[PDB]
Amino acid sequence: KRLSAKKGLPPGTLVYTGKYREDFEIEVMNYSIEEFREFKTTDVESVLPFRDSSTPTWINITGIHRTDVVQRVGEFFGIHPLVLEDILNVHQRPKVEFFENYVFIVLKMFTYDKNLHELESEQVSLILTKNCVLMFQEKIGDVFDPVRERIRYNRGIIRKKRADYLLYSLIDALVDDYFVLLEKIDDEIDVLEEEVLERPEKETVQRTHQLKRNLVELRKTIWPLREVLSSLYRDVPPLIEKETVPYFRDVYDHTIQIADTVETFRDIVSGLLDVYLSSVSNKTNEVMKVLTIIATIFMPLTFIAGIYGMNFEYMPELRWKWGYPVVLAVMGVIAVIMVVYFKKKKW
Amino acid sequence: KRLSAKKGLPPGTLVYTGKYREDFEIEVMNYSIEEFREFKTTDVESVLPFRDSSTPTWINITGIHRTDVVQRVGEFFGIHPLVLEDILNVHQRPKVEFFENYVFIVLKMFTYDKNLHELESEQVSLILTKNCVLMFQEKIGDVFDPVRERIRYNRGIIRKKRADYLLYSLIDALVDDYFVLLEKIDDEIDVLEEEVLERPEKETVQRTHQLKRNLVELRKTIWPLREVLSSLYRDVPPLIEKETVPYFRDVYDHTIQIADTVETFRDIVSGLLDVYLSSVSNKTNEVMKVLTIIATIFMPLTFIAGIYGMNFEYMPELRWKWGYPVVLAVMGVIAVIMVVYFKKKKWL
Amino acid sequence: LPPGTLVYTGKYREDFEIEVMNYSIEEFREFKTTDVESVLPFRDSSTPTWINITGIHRTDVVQRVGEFFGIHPLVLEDILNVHQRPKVEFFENYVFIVLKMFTYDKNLHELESEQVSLILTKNCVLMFQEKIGDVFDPVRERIRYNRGIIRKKRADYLLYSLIDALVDDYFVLLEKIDDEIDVLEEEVLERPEKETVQRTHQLKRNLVELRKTIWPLREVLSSLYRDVPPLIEKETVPYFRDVYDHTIQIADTVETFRDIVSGLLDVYLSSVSNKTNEVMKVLTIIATIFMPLTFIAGIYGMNFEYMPELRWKWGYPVVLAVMGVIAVIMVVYFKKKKWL
Amino acid sequence: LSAKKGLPPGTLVYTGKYREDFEIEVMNYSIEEFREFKTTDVESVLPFRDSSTPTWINITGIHRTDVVQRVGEFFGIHPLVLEDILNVHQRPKVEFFENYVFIVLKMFTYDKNLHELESEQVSLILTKNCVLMFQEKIGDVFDPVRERIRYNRGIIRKKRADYLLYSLIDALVDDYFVLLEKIDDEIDVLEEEVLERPEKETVQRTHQLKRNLVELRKTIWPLREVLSSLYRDVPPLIEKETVPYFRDVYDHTIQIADTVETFRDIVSGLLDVYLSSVSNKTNEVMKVLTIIATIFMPLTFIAGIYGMNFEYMPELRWKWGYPVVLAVMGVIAVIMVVYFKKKKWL
Amino acid sequence: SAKKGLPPGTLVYTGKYREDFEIEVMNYSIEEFREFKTTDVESVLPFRDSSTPTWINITGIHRTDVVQRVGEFFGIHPLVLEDILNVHQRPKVEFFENYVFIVLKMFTYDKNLHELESEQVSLILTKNCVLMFQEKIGDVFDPVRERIRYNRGIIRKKRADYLLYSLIDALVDDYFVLLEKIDDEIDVLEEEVLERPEKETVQRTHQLKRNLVELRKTIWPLREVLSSLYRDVPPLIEKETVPYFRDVYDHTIQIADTVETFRDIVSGLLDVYLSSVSNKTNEVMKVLTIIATIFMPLTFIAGIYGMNFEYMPELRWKWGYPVVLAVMGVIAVIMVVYFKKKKWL
Ligand SMILES: [Mg+2]
Ligand SMILES: [Mg+2]
Ligand SMILES: [Mg+2]
Ligand SMILES: [Mg+2]
Ligand SMILES: [Mg+2]
Ligand SMILES: [Mg+2]
């Protein structure tokens, strides 16, 4: 559930909010211009000595559900208790804030499942401190595999650079996965559009509503993305070096594009709703045309079949040619008049 | 009633605007690192000597309809009459004012009844004087109760800091109450969207309008809340210690999140109204399809029934070789043609 | 169209009076006199004095007053330019303010705006009004009976009191607008009719005009509070803040009302559409349980030479044994989707 | 209208539809002097470039491009700027050079016939102490500025050509305000029409203005840019003391944008109110249909059933069958119209 | 897209235009010009070291061999070649110390079938040559070719950076043409929705919404690219050419605002459609209600005067048959007068 409430606990408390409390691993990669070393341990105690390592280090504490390790890394790295609560509070808007000793950033990673329409969000909270980058996640597996491979095989300029470029690389991988997610959302948009244009029913409206809810969730998560990246570029904290400052513009620009795309998607969804409305109105019109064309034809027609079919005794219209087929010509000509009327009106 | 009737009065006058005039209680907790003292009383002159106590003190004055007590406190602790009238002006938007002696902050704490759809509010006014926090409410029933627990249980870090951290703790309790209220409203929105898409009714639009109006009122109350926390965060007077500023930043971020949630809720309900319109249009269209089918299959056949049967003489009928059943057969054939045409059109 | 001409733009030219009350701690002296000469000495009164020039249709009185008190001719033109927005200007010796008094009338959903001009002189306050009828009665009542602290404090507090009375009247107008909005909500939910939609649009226009008038008002009070010219004493800056705060509240309220009205019309649409749905069901459940039965009644009405009408149970009732039953069947159909 | 192809940027071809008129006028004003000229030749206006005092030189009827070319090469103006001057269907924009500032804006003419709007390019070039202004047709909205120069009102004479450009832009903004007043009159008329007498063609009008409003945005929103650059950049050609005046004009442009946006919102509301009124009116028509069908269809039911051929009718000649039929008619009809009164349909 | 999981160094032609291949070279100096078309790379290579400006247009990049050859000879990075061959991407601008890499998309829009088709054109500005790559045969750079051939304008006097400017100017001019075409389409759909609302109107307005989405998605990167071009002032671009790039940037801003206004207009088109269809449903309602009012009571009257039981005012009660016809006519006249008062048809 949304479960926005922690129910008034003291701010210094560290309590986990998410339901992802199965797997806990720590993956550490210390990479220098010439030396790379990686190790995966569940004991944070062997990871904590790398706080003061001169070479850049990427530490990954998967499964923040174990609050003991988060409290311990906060105790060493000088992380504020509020920042640690923000680590654990996975229902926290993405935000960036700069301290005298570290830069603390909160992002969301979105995943989309095919054959269904549901966004699943995983909070990734990362702190750049003393040429090291701590990452805090709640599920094994993430979107930073390209960064891992690049660090492993000396690809790109990441190896020649410090922890600021590691910050940039991680945020860049996350924004790239947002582009992948928006591609999936665009595919869903196209499917729903062809569905509404080709066959509208009573379930396409709930499909459109679910897609619109997904889009508003995306907006609520992505505008804080823009704020975060703008703050990362606009004004340079001492932790971030100028050499890597232009690189942030890249991801910042990317975020802007994402917003635009998401905004556009929103518009499309509204139009989809609109077109459905149009459909039913037009569909309504068609139906009534039939209900009119029959009526205007047969409601008067039966009239004659009534007005010349009463129980009147010795009525004058009796005799004539014969009495029965003389009126049928009138019936046919008035029906043809109605048919021509609705043909020239194109109904 | 929710009507602004402080007009026709001098600005220094103090008149209570709201409706809760039932209970009047004074709760005092003077807490320190070592020991704390609690004091429930109904005489203000007992709580006056707490102004100059060095240890931080918290004075909850509920039921501010007792204007005499508020005037006495304003005279003693040294609060301007405008601030007192704003305390007693229930329809005062949340705000913050940094005076030289104190800081005065008006917030609104809400109550949502799930069974009904009306959302109620009351005003909480906090005055911080570098040694004490005077907070005024309208009635008993609070959200600050967990805060009291900390004071009574030495829990957390509240008992180690000054009165500015107490202001923090109360404001954070209010923001947590707001988060609870948004959870309740989100549940209401889920129920409303389920009813809109599933079973449109006449009362559905009324409930949707009530929810939209409640969300608009909530937004009107929350944007001043964000402004207040921005004021408490970005630039601080000497009243708030530098140690308390990051905590106020936390509360500012919380209020930002709440405002974003309210905006998303407003967009969702605005979409929901049009979704309901489309659904009722579609149901109306299906009813019209039923009507059109029945009309096309029974009115022309009524015209055949009218052709046969008048007052007349000498049409091709001569018992027409028992032609009545074949007349019915032709009638049924026409009906079958109509129904298969509509099945091809997929109207059935 | 001279750049500095003094022409009464407004249309209220039916009444004229002058009300001067020189008030202080010791004593208040109040009078009303059509002659403008009696106004002139109070220019140089040390104690605060309030001069209300009701009716600006006579440009002679407005001119004479401005020329003797030192008001620039262009400021006098702005006074006589009724069709104007709320404004604030600061000079060396006087502060010029233009605000609007709003009147809301029932049974005719319109706003009547009367431009009021306030000039602060550090020794007196000059008020120019379009016509008899002002929202400042609490202020003059306060001055008369020594209520509040208005008598003790100087003309700055007098200007604050007048602007506060204006803002309180704006609150009254907003309360009336809220009552109208509640009535419109009830009407659109229950009795849409036709005049409701035009009243909704008229109230939308009223709120547009109110916002267009109030946002300059909040700018004026922001100017009066954020920067304090030597005319306004420092001791009176907090009081202006209150008015400013009130104005902010007012603006918020207007926006809220706007939002509500923005929904109302849409809600109306939904409501009336739902009404149509019922009119569908009533027409359908009555055009499908009778017309097939009208057909059944017409089947055996075919007067033929041969007919199987000769059958068991004599004539008539034998049809109904199915006929009415068919109607019952129809009900079941509706009962399986709640079309009733 | 944007087809300008097969032409290098240096080509100077006029785009608009006005070619009848051509005049050139000069106002050479100082803090004591004033000179007014009005001719149709470039030789008279040419030597005014080197005048120390501010010189406002206006060219109406820019269709004859050779005068624009002559003032282009004589004043050291890029041929691109000359083409932009002749390019009528070009958005308003301000460009700063090391010598001159070229700002292009639009003047709007609105008259009540057909509820249509027209635009005219006006292009200013501030060069040292000269203002080259170009416009397509005779007549403009700088008559207040002309009177201010002629009769030495205000502080325009005391200042440089920077304040002259300020006054020109402020006059354009004031004309935009008059435009917005006329537009508001038009939406008031349309509101009265839709609220009082909705018609089939009203939608056209209800959308016509809407389209026009969007068009105004396509011109008004660029102005928000061009005045912003007139104070944010504040290049040395524009004096430092002139910036607050451009701040005031920028605020006026923001005000224009707010007014045009709320006008568009009112027009959208007019579309919504028309749709609501049409829905209510068709609802009323179906109400008439529903009462007639409901109260006359069971009447046809009883008429068919008691007037239907049977071998042995139980009624036959039982009693006064015709009064009985009329009585049951009346009973059910009054019952069902009371039902309709309860539903308030009739 | 077509490529998935490939390492970021592979040269694949993602596009679907493989019909035609040709290479045209136009080498122009302020003195003379020389143009020739072929399908070989050997006669294209020598122009790299020629000081005089040259324009080498590779029409048809389905041949990865030729693109690789010219890229590796002209000092173009394999990544840039991959970007050239990668069709489905945003317009890009990249600055290298010896060449400037630009990716733009030129559109073609046909009135008969309302579907705009994109073609990625890629420009590489070296110190003395402009290397252009196109997807298929056909472009809008014909005016630039004419200027080169007939010395029109100042293109021949200037350097190759002015040629890059001229090509981008031609592309934005084609954008203006296509904006005009869609403006005409929007006007046609405005009329059709306003007075002749049908299903095809809704299908076409959704198609226009999608097409305008694609247009803005491709034009905002165009604005960013030209902004970079005239503000970054790279050493490849001369300072004398920057005003031309600024002019093209103004053109692109105008295109962007026009596209946004078109989007707003088309968005309002759907509301206008709902209003018009509601009006049409209202007038059909009117027709049905008029017919019902003027015939259903008359059928009832005929039924109740056609009852088969005996007791009835029959046998010409003062000519009863014209009496009932007169009563029916009076009822019909009352109904039609009431509806004329109601202003119905
Ligand atoms: Mg907390
Ligand atoms: Mg937090
Ligand atoms: Mg008979
Ligand atoms: Mg007051
Ligand atoms: Mg019969
Ligand atoms: Mg050109």
Rounded distance between C-alpha atoms, residue D3 and residue E178, angstroms = 10
Cα–Cα distance for residue pair A276/B276, rounded to 1 Å: 12
| Amino acid in the structure at residue D115 | H
How far apart (Å, rounded) are the C-alpha atoms in residues D169 and D222?
Answer: 14
Please indicate whether, in this complex, the C-beta atoms of E282 and D286 are within 8 angstroms of each other.
no
Identify whether the C-beta of residue C151 lies closer than 8 Å to the C-beta of residue C25: yes
Instruction: Name every residue whose Cβ is closer than 8 Å to that of residue C136 and which is 6 or more positions away in sequence.
Output: C52, C127, C162, C165
Q: Which residue has the tokens 């799930």?
A: B114
Residue of E nearest to D269 (CA): E271
SS3 C51: strand
DSSP string, E237-262: S-TTTHHHHHHHHHHHHHHHHHHHHH
Q: Do D294 and C282 touch (CB under 8 A)?
A: yes
CB distance from E326 to chain A under 8 Å?
no
B294 contacts on C by Cβ (under 8 Å):
284, 287-288, 291-292
Strand partners, E58: E23, E133
Both tokens of B124, joined, read 């909480």
A92 touches chain B (CB under 8 A): yes
Structure determined via = cryo-EM
Q: Which helix (H) or strand (E) holds E104?
A: strand E100-108
**Hey, is B261 helix, strand or coil?**
helix
Q: Any idea which residue has 């970021």 for tokens?
A: E8
How far is residue B66 CA from its own chain's centroid? 28
E11: which 2 tokens?
């040269």
Q: CB contact, 8 Å: A15 with chain B?
A: no
Phi, psi at D117, each rounded to 5°: -125, 150
Cα–Cα nearest to D19, from D86, D72, D80:
D86
Q: Cα(D178)–Cα(D119) distance, rounded to whole angstroms?
A: 14
C-alpha span between E84 and E68 (Å, rounded) = 10
Supply the DSSP symbol for D49: G
Which residue from C256, A28, A84, A227 is spatially nearest to B93, judged by alpha carbons?
C256
d(CA E263, CA D268): 15
Pair D193, D202: CB distance under 8 Å: yes
User: By C-alpha distance, which of E202, E276, E269 is closest to A276?
Assistant: E202
- Between helix C137-144 and helix C155-190 the angle, nearest 10°, is 140
DSSP B138-189: SSS--S-HHHHHHHHHT-TTGGGS-HHHHHHHHHHHHHHHHHHHHHHHHHHH
| SS3 (DSSP) at C128 | strand
Inter-residue contact A12 to B168 (CB < 8 Å): no
C11 backbone dihedrals φ, ψ, rounded to 5°: -110, -10
Give the Å distance between the CA of B169 and the centre of ligand 1.
Answer: 9
E153 CA from centroid of ligand 1 (Å): 70
| A neighbours by CB contacts (3+ pairs under 8 Å) | B, E
Q: How many Cβ atoms from other residues are within 10 Å of residue C83's Cβ?
A: 9
Q: What is the 3-state secondary structure (H, E, C) of chain A?
A: CCCCCCCCCCCCCCCCCCCCCCCCEEEEEEECCCCEEEEEECCHHHCHHHHCCCCCEEEEEECCCCHHHHHHHHHHHCCCHHHHHHHHCCCCCCEEEECCCEEEEEEEEEEECCCCCCEEEEEEEEEEECCEEEEECCCCCCCCHHHHHHHHCCCCCCCCCCHHHHHHHHHHHHHHHHHHHHHHHHHHHHHHHHHHHHCCCCCHHHHHHHHHHHHHHHHHHHHHHHHHHHHHHCCCCCCCCHHHHHHHHHHHHHHHHHHHHHHHHHHHHHHHHHHHHHHHHHHHHHHHHHHHHHHHHHHHHHHHHHHCCCCCCCCCCCCCCCCCHHHHHHHHHHHHHHHHHHHHCCC
Whether chain D has a CB inside 8 Å of the CB on C1: the answer is no
Residue A345 to residue E283: CA distance in whole angstroms: 12
Please report, for residues B94, C212, C220, C238, the alpha-carbon distance to residue C215 in angstroms, rounded to integers and kept in the order given. Answer: 20, 6, 9, 21
Nearest to A284 among E281, E292, E298 (CB): E281
Nearest to E323 by CA among E313, E332, E333: E313
Spatial CA neighbour of E181 closest among E243, E116, E89, E225: E116
Whether residues C293 and D313 touch (CB distance < 8 A) is answered with no
Phi and psi (nearest 5°) for E24? -115, 130
Name the token pair of B268: 């969702």
DSSP assignment of D177-240? HHHHHHHHHHHHHHHHHHHHS--STHHHHHHHHHHHHHHHHHHHHHHHHHHHHHHHT--TTS-G
What is the enclosing helix (H) or strand (E) of D287?
helix D243-306
Q: Which residues contact A210 (CB under 8 A, 6 or more apart)?
A: A117
Tokens 């009065």 found at:
B9
**Are the CB atoms for C94 and C57 separated by under 8 Å?**
no
**DSSP conformation class of D15:** -
Query: A34-51 in b/e burial notation, b at 16+ Cβ within 10 A?
Result: eeeeeeeeeebeebbeeb
Cα distances (angstroms) measured from residue E186 to each of D219, D334, E190, E213, E252: 20, 55, 6, 14, 20
Which ligand neighbours the alpha carbon of B176 most closely?
1
How far apart are the two ends of chain D, measured CA to CA in Å? 57
Q: Of B61, B72, B68, which is closest to residue B24 (Cα–Cα)?
A: B61
Q: Which distant-in-sequence residues (6+ apart) come within 8 Å of E195 by Cβ? A: E276
Helices B202-234/B163-198 angle, 10° precision = 160
H/E stretch holding C247: helix C237-287
Strand-pair partners of E95: E100
Q: Does the CB of D314 have a partner CB in chain C at under 8 Å?
A: yes
Contact C116, C127 (CB under 8 A): yes
Residue A157 Cα distances to A131, A132, A150, A169, D144, angstroms: 16, 17, 9, 10, 64
First-last CA distance in chain A: 52
Cα radius of gyration rounded to whole Å, chain A: 34
The answer to whether A280 and B284 are in contact (CB under 8 A) is: no
Adjacency order of strands within the sheet including E117-125: E33-38, E22-28, E54-59, E129-134, E117-125, E100-108, E92-95
* Contact (CB, 8 A) for D270 and D187: yes
Listed in sequence order, the residues at least 6 apart from A61 whose beta carbon sits closer than 8 Å to its beta carbon are: A26, A44, A69, A70, A73, A134, A135, A136, A137
* DSSP per-residue string spanning D106-125: EEEEEETGGGEEEEEEEEEE
DSSP state of B59: E
H or E segment to which residue B341 belongs: helix B324-344
**H helices of chain E, where?**
64-73, 78-85, 142-150, 160-195, 199-231, 242-304, 320-341
What lies within 8 Å, CB to CB, of D19 at 6+ separation is D61, D63, D64
Cα–Cα distance, D251 to D105 (Å, whole number): 17
- Neighbouring chains to B with at least 3 Cβ pairs closer than 8 Å: A, C
- The DSSP result for E75-86, as a single string, is T--HHHHHHHH-
What's the distance, CA A188 to chain centroid? Answer: 11
Q: Which of A4, A280, A311 sits opposite B285 (nearest CB)?
A: A280
Query: Which residues on adjacent β-strands are paired with residue C98?
Result: C87, C117
B76 Cα: distance to centroid of ligand 4 (angstroms): 22
Q: Which two tokens stand for residue D243?
A: 């910036």
Phi, psi of A317, rounded to the nearest 5 degrees:
-70, -10
Amino acid at A313: E
Distances (CA, A) of D203 to B324, D3, D274, E280: 55, 32, 8, 12
**Alpha-carbon gap, residue B117 to B111, rounded angstroms:** 11
Q: How many CB atoms lie within 10 A of CB B110?
A: 22
Structure tokens at E126: 């070296």
Q: Taking Cα atoms as reference points, which of A137, A13, A141, A143 lies closest to residue A64?
A: A137
CA A13 to ligand 1 center in whole angstroms = 8
A207 touches chain B (CB under 8 A): no
Residues B168, B174, B177, B178, Cα dihedral to 10°: -110
Are B292 and C288 within 8 A, CB to CB? no
C-alpha distances out from residue D47 to A60, A334, B163, D28, D75, Å: 76, 87, 77, 11, 11
CB B19 within 8 A of CB C181: no
- Cα–Cα distance between D216 and D15 in angstroms, integer? 20
With helix as H, strand as E and coil as C, how does E272-312 read? HHHHHHHHHHHHHHHHHHHHHHHHHHHHHHHHHCCCCCCCC
Buried b (16+ CB within 10 A) or exposed e, D121-150: bbbbbbbbbbbbbbbbbeebbbebbbebbe
E266 CA to centre of own chain: 13
b (16+ CB within 10 A) / e for E202-239: bebbbbbbbbbbebbbbbbbbbbbbbbbbeeeeebbee
Of B244, B64, B281, B233, nearest to B157 (Cα)?
B244
CB C142 within 8 A of CB C129: no
> Which candidate, E219, E255, E230, places its Cα nearest to that of E104?
E219
- What whole-number distance in Å separates Cα of residue C329 and Cα of residue B62? 65
Pairing outcome for strands C95-104 and D130-135: unpaired
Reported resolution in A?
Answer: 3.3
Q: What is the DSSP letter of E74?
A: T
CA E331 to chain centre: 59
Do the chains contact at C283 and D273, CB–CB below 8 Å? no
3-class SS at E6? coil
Give the containing element (helix H, strand E) for D321: helix D321-343
The tally of CA atoms less than 13 A away on the side-chain side of residue B269 is 29
- The count of C-alpha atoms lying within 13 angstroms of the C-alpha of A281, restricted to the half-sphere facing its C-beta, is 28
Instruction: Order across the sheet with C95-104: list the strands.
Output: C28-32, C17-23, C49-54, C125-129, C111-120, C95-104, C87-90
Q: Is B97 helix (H, G, I), strand (E, B) or coil?
A: strand
**CA–CA dist A313, E315 (Å, integer):** 6
Cα dihedral across residues A65, A66, A69, A71: positive or negative: positive
